CSV table of C-alpha atoms in Angstrom, one decimal:
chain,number,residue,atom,x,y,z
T,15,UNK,CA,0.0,0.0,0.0
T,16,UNK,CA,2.0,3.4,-1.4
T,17,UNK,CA,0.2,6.4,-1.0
T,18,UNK,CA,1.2,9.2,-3.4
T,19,UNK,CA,1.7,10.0,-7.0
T,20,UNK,CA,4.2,8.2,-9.4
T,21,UNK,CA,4.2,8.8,-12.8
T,22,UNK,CA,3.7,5.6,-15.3
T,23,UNK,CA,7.0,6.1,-16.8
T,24,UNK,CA,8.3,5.2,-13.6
T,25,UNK,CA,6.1,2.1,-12.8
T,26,UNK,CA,9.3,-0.4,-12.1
T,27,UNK,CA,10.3,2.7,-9.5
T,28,UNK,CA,7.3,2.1,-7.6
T,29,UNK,CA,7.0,-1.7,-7.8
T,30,UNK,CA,10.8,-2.2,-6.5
T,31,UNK,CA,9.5,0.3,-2.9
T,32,UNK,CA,6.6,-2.2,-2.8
T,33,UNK,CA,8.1,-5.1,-2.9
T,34,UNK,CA,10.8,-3.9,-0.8
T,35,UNK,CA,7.9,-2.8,2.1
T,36,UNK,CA,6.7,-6.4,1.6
T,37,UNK,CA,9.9,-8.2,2.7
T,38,UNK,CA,10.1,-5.8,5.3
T,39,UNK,CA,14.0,-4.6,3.5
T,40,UNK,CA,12.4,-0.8,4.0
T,41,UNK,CA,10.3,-0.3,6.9
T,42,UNK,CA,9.2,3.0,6.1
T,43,UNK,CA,10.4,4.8,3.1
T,44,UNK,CA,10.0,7.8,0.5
T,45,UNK,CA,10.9,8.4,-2.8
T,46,UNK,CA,10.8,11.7,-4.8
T,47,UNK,CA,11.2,12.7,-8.1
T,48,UNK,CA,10.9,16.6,-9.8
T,49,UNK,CA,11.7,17.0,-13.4
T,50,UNK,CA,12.5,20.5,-14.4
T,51,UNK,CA,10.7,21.7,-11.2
T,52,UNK,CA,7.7,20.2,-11.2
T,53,UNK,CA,7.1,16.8,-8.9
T,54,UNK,CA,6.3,14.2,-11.1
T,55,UNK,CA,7.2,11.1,-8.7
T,56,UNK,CA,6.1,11.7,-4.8
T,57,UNK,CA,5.1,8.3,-3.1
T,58,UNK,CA,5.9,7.4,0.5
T,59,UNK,CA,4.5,3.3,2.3
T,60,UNK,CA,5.8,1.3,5.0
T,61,UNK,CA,5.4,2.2,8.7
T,62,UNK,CA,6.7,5.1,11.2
T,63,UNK,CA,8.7,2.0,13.0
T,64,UNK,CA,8.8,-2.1,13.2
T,65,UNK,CA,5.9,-1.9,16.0
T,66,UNK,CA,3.4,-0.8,12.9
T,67,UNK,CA,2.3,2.0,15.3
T,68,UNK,CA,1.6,4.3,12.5
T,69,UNK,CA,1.9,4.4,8.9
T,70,UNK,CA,4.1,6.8,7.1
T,71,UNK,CA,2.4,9.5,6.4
T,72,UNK,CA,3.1,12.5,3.4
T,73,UNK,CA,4.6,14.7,6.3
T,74,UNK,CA,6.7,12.0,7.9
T,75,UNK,CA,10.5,13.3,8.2
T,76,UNK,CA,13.3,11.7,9.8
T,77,UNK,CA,17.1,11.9,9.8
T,78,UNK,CA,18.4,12.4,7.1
T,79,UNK,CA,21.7,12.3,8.0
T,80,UNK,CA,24.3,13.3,5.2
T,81,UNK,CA,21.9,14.7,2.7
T,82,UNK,CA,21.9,17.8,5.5
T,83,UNK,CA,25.4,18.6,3.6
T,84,UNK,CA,23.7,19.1,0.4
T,85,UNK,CA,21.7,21.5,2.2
T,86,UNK,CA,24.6,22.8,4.4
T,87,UNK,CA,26.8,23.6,0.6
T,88,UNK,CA,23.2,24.8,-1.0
T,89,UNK,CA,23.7,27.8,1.7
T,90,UNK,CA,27.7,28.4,1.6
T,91,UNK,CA,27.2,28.6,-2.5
T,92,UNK,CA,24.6,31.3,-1.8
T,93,UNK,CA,26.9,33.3,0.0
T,94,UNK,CA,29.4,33.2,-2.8
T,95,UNK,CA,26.3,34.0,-5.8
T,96,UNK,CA,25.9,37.3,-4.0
T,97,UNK,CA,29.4,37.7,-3.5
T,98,UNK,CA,30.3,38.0,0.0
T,99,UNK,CA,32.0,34.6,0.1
T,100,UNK,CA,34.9,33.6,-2.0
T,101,UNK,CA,36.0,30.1,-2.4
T,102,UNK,CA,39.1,31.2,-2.9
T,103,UNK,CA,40.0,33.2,-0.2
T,104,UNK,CA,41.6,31.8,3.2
T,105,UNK,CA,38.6,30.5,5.6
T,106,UNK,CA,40.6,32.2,8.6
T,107,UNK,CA,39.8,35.7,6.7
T,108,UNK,CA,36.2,35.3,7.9
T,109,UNK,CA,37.3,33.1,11.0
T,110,UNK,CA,40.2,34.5,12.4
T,111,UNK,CA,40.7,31.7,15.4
T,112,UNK,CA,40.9,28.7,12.5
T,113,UNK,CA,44.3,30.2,11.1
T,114,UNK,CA,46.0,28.6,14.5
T,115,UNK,CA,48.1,25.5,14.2
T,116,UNK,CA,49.2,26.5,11.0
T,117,UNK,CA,45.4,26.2,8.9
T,118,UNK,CA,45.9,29.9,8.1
T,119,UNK,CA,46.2,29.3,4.2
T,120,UNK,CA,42.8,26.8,4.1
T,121,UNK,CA,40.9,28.0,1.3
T,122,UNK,CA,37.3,27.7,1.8
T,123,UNK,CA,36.5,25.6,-1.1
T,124,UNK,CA,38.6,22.8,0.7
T,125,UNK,CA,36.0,22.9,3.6
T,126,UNK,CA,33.3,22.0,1.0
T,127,UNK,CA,35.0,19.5,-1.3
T,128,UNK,CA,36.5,17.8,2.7
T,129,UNK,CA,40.1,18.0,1.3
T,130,UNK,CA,40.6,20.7,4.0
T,131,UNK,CA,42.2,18.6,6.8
T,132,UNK,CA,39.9,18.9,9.4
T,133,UNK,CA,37.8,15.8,9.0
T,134,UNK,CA,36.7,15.3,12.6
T,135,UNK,CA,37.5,16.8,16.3
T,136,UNK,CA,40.5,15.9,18.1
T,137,UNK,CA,39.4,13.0,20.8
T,138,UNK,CA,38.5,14.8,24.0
T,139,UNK,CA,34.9,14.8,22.1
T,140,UNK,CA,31.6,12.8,23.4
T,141,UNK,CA,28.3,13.0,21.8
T,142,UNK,CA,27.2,16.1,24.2
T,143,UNK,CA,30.4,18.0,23.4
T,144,UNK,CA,28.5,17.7,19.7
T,145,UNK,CA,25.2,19.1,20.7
T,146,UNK,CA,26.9,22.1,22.0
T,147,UNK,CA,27.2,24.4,18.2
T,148,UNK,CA,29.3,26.9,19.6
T,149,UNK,CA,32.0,24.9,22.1
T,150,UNK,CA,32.1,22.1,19.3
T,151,UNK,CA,32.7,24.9,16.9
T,152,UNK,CA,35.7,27.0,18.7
T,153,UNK,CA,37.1,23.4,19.3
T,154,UNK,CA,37.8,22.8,15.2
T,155,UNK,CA,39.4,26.4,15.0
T,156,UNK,CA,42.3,25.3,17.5
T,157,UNK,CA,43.4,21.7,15.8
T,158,UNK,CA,46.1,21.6,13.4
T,159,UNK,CA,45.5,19.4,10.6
T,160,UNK,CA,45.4,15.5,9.9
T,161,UNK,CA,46.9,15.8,6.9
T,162,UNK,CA,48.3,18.5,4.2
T,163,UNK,CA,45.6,20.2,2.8
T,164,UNK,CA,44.4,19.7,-0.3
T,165,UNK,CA,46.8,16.8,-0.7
T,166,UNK,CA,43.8,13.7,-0.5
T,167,UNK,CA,40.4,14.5,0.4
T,168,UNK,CA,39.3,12.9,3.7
T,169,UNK,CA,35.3,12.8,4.8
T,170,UNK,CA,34.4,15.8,7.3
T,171,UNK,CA,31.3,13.1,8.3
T,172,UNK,CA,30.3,15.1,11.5
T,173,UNK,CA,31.7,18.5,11.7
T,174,UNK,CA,31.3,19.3,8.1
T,175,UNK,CA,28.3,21.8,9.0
T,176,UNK,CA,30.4,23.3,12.2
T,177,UNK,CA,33.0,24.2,9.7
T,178,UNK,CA,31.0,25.8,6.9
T,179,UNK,CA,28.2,27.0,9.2
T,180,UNK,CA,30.4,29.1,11.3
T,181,UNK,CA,31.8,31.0,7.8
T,182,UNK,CA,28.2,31.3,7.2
T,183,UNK,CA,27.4,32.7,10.5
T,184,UNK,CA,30.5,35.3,10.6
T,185,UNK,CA,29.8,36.7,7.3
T,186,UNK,CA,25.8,36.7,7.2
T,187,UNK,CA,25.2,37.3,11.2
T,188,UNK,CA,22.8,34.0,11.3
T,189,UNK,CA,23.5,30.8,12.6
T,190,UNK,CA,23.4,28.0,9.7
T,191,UNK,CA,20.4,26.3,10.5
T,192,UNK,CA,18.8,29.6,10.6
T,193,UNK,CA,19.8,30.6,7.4
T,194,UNK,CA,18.7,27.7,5.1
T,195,UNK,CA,15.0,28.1,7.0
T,196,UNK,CA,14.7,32.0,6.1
T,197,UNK,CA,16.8,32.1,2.9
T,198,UNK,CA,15.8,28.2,1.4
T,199,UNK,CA,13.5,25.8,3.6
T,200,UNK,CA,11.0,29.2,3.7
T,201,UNK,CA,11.4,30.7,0.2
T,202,UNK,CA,10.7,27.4,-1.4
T,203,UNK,CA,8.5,26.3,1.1
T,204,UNK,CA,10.0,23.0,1.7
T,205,UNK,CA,9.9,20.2,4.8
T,206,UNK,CA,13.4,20.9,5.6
T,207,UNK,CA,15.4,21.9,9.3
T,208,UNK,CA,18.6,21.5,11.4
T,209,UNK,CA,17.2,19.4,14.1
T,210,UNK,CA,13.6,19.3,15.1
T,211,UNK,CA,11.7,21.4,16.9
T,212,UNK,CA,9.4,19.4,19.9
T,213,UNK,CA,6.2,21.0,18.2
T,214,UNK,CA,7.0,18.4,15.3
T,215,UNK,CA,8.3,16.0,17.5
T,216,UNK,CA,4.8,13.7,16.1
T,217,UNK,CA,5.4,13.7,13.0
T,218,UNK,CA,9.1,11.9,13.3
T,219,UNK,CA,9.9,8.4,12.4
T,220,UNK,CA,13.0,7.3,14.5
T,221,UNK,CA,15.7,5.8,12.2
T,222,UNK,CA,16.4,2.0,13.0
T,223,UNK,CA,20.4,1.7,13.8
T,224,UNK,CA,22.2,-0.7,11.3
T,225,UNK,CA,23.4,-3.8,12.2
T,226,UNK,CA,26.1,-3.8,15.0
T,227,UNK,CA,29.7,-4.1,14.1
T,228,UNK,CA,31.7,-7.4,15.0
T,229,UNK,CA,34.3,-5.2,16.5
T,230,UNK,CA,34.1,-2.4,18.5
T,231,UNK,CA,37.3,0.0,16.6
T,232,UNK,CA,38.3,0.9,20.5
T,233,UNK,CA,42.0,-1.3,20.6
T,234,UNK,CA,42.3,-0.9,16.8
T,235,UNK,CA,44.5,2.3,16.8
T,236,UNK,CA,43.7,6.1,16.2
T,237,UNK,CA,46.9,6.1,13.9
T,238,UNK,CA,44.1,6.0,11.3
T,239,UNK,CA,42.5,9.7,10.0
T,240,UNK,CA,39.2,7.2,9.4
T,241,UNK,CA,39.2,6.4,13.0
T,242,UNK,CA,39.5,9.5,14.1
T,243,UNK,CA,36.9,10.8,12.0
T,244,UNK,CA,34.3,8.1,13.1
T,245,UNK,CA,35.3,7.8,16.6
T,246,UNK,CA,35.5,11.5,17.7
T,247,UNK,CA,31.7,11.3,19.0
T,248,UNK,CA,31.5,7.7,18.8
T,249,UNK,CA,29.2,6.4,16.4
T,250,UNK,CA,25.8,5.6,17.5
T,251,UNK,CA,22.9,6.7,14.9
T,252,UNK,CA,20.3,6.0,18.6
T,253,UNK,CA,22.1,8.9,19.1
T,254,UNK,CA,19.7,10.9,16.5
T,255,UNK,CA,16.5,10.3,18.7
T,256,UNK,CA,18.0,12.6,21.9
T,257,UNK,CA,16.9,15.6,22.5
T,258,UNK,CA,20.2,17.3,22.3
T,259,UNK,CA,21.1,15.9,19.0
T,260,UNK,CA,17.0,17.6,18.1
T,261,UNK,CA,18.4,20.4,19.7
T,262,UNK,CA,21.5,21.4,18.0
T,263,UNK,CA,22.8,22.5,14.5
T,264,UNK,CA,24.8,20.2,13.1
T,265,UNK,CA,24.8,21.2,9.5
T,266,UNK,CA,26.3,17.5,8.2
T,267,UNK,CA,24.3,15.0,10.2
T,268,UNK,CA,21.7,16.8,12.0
T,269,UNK,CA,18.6,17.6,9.1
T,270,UNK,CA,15.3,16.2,9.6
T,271,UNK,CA,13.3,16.2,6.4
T,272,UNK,CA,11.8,13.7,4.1
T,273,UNK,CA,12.8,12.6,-0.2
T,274,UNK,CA,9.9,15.8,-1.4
T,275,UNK,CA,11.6,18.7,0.6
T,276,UNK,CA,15.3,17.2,-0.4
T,277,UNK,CA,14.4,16.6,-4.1
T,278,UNK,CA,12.6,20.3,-3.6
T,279,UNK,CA,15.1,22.2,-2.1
T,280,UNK,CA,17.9,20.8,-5.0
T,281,UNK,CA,15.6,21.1,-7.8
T,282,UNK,CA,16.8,24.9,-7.6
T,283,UNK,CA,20.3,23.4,-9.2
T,284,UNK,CA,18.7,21.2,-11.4
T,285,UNK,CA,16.8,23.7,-13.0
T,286,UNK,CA,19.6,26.6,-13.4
T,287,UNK,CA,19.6,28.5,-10.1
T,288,UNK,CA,15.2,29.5,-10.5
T,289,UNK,CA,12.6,27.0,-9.9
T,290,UNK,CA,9.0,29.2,-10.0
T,291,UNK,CA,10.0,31.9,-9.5
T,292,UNK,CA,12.4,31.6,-6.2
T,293,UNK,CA,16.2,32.1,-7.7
T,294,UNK,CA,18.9,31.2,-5.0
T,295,UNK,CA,21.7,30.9,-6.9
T,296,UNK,CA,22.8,31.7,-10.8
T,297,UNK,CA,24.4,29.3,-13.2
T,298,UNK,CA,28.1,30.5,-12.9
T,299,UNK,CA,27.7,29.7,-9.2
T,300,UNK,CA,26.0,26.7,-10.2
T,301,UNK,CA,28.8,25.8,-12.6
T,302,UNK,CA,31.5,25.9,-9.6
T,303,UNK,CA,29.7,22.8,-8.0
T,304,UNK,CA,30.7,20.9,-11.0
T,305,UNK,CA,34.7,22.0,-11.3
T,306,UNK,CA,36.5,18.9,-10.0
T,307,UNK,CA,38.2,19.5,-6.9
T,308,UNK,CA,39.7,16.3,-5.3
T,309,UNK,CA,40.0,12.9,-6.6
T,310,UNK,CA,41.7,9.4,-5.4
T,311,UNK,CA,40.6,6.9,-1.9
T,312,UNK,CA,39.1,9.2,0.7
T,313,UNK,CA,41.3,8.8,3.8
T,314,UNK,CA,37.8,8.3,5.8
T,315,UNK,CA,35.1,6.3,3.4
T,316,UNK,CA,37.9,4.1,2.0
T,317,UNK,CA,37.2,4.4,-1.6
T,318,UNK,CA,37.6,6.4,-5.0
T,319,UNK,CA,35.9,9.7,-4.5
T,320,UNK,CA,35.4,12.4,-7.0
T,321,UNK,CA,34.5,15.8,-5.3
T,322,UNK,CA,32.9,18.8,-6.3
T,323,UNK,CA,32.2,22.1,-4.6
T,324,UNK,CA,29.4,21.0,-1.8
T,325,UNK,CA,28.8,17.8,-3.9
T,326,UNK,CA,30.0,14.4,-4.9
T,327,UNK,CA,30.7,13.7,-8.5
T,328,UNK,CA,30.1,10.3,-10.4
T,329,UNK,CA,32.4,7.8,-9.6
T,330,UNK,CA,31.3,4.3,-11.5
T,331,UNK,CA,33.7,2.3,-9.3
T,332,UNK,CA,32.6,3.3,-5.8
T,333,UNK,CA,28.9,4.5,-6.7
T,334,UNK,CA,28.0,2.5,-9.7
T,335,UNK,CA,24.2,3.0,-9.6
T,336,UNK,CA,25.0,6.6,-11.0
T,337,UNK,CA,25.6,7.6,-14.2
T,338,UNK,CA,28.5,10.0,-15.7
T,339,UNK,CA,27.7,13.6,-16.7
T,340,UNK,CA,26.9,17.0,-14.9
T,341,UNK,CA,25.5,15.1,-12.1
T,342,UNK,CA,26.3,16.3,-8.3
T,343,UNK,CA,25.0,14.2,-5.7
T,344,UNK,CA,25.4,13.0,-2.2
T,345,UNK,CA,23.5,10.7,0.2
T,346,UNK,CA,23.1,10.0,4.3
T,347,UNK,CA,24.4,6.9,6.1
T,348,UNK,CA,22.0,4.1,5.9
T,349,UNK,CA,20.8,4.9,2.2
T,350,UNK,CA,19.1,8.3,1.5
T,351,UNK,CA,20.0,9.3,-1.8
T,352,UNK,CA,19.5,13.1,-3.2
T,353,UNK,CA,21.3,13.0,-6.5
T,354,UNK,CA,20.6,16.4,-9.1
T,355,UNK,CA,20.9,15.7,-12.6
T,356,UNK,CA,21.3,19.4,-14.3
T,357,UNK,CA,21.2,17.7,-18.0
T,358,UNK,CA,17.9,15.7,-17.5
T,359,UNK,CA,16.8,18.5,-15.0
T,360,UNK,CA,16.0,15.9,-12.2
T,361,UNK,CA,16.1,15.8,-9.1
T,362,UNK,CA,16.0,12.1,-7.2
T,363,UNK,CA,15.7,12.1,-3.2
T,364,UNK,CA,15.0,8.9,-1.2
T,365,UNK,CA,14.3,8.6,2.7
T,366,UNK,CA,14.4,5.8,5.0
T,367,UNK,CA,14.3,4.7,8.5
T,368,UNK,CA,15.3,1.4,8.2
T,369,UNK,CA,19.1,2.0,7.7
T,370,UNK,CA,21.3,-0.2,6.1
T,371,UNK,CA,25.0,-0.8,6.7
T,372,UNK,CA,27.4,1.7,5.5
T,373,UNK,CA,27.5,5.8,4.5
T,374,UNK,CA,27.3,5.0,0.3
T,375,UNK,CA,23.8,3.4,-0.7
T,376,UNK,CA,22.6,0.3,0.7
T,377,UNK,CA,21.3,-2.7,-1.9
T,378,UNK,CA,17.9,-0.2,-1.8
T,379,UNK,CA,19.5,2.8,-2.7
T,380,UNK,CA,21.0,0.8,-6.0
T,381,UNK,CA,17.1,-0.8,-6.8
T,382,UNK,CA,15.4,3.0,-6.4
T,383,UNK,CA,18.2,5.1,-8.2
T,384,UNK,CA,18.5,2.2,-11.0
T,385,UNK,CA,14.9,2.2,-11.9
T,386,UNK,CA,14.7,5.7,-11.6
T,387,UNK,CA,17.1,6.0,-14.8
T,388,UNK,CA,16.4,3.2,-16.7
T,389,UNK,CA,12.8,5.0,-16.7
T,390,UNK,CA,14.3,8.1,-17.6
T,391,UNK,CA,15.5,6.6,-21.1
């Protein structure tokens, strides 16, 4: 039972998220689809959790988690289409306290493509030190960095919105999460925070945590950048159903939305910068998402990435299920997918609660972005 419209083209789409409710693979789920700005596939099914308390419903969000970052560079490109922030210029010219321990060259382009260094707190850090914005914050200006910047490009999985958000903050006078809900969530009217508020506390659908690793990484060496990175507040995705974690802005992790307010809120790049008549951004701003900046194996995911400005870029050997071309997309760990297809004019977005293991797609997230393009040709 999907409630919802799906276009016919996209039959197989909807057929796959049925048959994956069935088996019980996706507990609760939503898939989106815009073309050239208007929605043309918006179905949700499945359940609110495994209890069958309630049954998704079309203003069900959740955690979304790492689609937040699409959301997170959305806001920092904005900045730079008016001109008051240049990708090019030193982060610590906006930030004065990051140019300690030697970061005082960091361009601020190498925040958003995560080739900056500064992939993850240094390890006095717990999972309240991360609900606090502005004490997590000042703690990133005073580490030196992991690596040489720009040298490899190594995931900023948790801090990436403490980084970018405080450049944000300094230059515009808002905090982030702020920001995207007067100048994008509002002005395209989509289902889209940092955190959640308690007065939509009912309409939540707590992720399910992915199965438990063999080993705990504790005895295994922080040596590693990746442990580092995934250890510095240990990872626990319970952790998204706290009020603190609700409470705080946490621009890479912390968004609570659904796949029609993602595939929404992107269809502004898919469509040149203007979808309506609500422009956020122009197409030379547009075209700096798509200038490689990085590629090789991620010191943190462990594979060949390909990054842009704010977004990943096709990589066939680690994300096969998307094609080459002007195509910048990214996703959040258990399987949500938001990919943005400027030559087809797409937008895809799909939402979980059910997560799978690892922080690429899950065996769903390859079934729903597959049928979504072979329907597309």
């Amino acid at each position: 039972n999907i409630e919802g419209v799906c276009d016919q083209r996209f039959s197989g789409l909807k057929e796959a998220l049925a048959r994956n409710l069935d088996s019980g693979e996706d507990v609760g789920a939503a898939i989106a689809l815009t073309i050239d700005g208007e929605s043309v596939v918006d179905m949700w099914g499945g359940w609110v959790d495994v209890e069958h308390t309630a049954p998704w419903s079309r203003d069900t969000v959740t955690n979304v988690w790492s689609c937040s970052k699409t959301v997170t560079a959305l806001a920092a490109l904005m900045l730079v289409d008016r001109g008051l922030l240049d990708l090019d210029a030193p982060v610590a010219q906006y930030w004065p306290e990051f140019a300690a321990a030697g970061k005082d060259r960091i361009r601020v382009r190498q925040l958003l493509s995560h080739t900056s260094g500064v992939s993850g707190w240094d390890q006095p850090f717990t999972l309240e030190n991360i609900c606090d914005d502005e004490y997590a914050t000042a703690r990133l200006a005073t580490q030196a960095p992991w690596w040489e910047p720009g040298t490899a490009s190594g995931y900023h999985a948790l801090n990436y919105g403490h980084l970018i958000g405080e450049v944000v903050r300094r230059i515009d006078g808002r905090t982030l999460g702020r920001f995207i809900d007067e100048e994008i969530a509002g002005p395209l009217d989509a289902d889209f925070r940092l955190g959640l508020p308690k007065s939509e506390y009912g309409r939540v659908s707590n992720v399910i945590a992915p199965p438990p690793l063999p080993i705990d990484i504790a005895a295994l060496g922080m040596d590693n950048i990746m442990v580092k990175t995934f250890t510095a507040p240990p990872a626990d995705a319970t952790g998204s159903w706290t009020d603190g974690w609700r409470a705080a802005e946490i621009g890479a992790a912390n968004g609570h939305s659904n796949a029609r307010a993602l595939a929404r809120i992107q269809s502004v790049i898919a469509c040149g910068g203007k979808v309506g008549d609500v422009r956020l951004l122009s197409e030379e701003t547009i075209d700096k998402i798509f200038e490689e900046q990085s590629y090789g194996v991620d010191l943190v995911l462990g594979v060949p990435v390909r990054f842009g400005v704010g977004f990943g870029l096709p990589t066939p050997e680690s994300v096969p299920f998307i094609p080459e071309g002007r195509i910048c997309f990214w996703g959040g760990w258990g399987g949500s997918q938001i990919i943005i297809d400027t030559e087809k004019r797409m937008t895809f977005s799909y939402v979980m609660n059910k997560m799978g293991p690892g922080l690429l797609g899950s065996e769903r997230s390859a079934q729903y972005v597959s049928a979504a393009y072979d329907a597309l040709s």
